[PDB]
């Protein structure tokens, strides 16, 4: 902008959306990337592969289309994240994808987080992904227990819209139960 000699960062750098140094290291695997992302309300998992004119998404799952299988709960929590990964994973297996590397973009590797939940989901779906168990939240939290107990300290319903009062991690079970099933329309 200042003059001829001025150096403008690559577009995805200006936009602060792509960590190019991490990306390169990610791509050195030769494997597809399990792109885990988040929004204030949603969680998205994509299986991306390298291409001539840009990346190629071979499969993916959004937390929104989770309801499409019997989900009436919010879509920005642990249970949602895990299931969203699993869904994406299952679809990945469908398209012939068998292995991946976790790309968490600009998110932090915090133990027990959602991008790690998405990973546990995608792994159970049958996808081989380099991981570390003791960095994944314990089972119960994935189910959504941490939120149930939070609702125990009631006095006023945690969820505004009525999905339930004491919430339900048991619903998480029903959904995972439904996804691991063969029938399911992917």
């Amino acid at each position: 902008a200042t003059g001829p000699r001025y150096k403008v960062p690559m577009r995805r750098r200006r936009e602060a959306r792509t960590d190019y140094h991490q990306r390169l290291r990610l791509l050195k695997s030769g494997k597809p990337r399990l792109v885990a992302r988040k929004s204030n309300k949603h969680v998205r998992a994509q299986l991306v592969t390298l291409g001539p004119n840009g990346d190629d998404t071979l499969a993916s799952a959004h937390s929104s289309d989770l309801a499409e299988y019997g989900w009436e709960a919010p879509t920005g929590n642990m249970p949602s994240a895990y299931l969203t990964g699993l869904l994406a994973g299952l679809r990945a297996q469908e398209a012939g994808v068998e292995e991946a590397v976790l790309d968490i973009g600009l998110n932090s590797p915090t133990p027990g987080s959602k991008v790690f939940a998405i990973q546990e989901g995608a792994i159970d779906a049958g996808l081989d992904i380099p991981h570390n168990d003791d960095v994944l939240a314990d089972w119960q939290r994935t189910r959504g227990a941490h939120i149930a107990e939070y609702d125990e300290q009631l006095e006023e319903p945690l969820y505004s819209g009525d999905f339930d009062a004491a919430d339900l991690p048991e619903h998480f079970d029903e959904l995972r139960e439904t996804l691991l099933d063969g029938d399911i329309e992917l």
Partner: protein, 140 residues
Amino acid sequence: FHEMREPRIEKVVVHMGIGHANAEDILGEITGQMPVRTKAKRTVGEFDIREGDPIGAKVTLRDEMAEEFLQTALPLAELATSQFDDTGNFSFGLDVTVNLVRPGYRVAKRDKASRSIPTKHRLNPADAVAFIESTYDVEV
């Protein structure tokens, strides 16, 4: 249009720039939360050749902690027009700095897709003098 444009207090930073501390204790009482050591840079003739070493302490307050402090700190000063930033910030006094900003300031403080706050959304000295003066005291 105004609810998302009306100012607020991002942080109140209280700090004592000494030069070698024992003063952390008073800041912990006048503010309510733990203070932080202050290291210096570059060597200085004034027997200050040690790069990293205690030389001060500060405490950054946010939310209630910030207001509950100003309710007893502001009355201890005589704010003036010149004593204000070009961004709508002011510091008085033991130093006391007040960082004011508009709602979605996070856009420039978050990790992902962060962005610089447009000059139009940047607070102004005038818009700042108002907000504050419009709360327990006078201007110049």
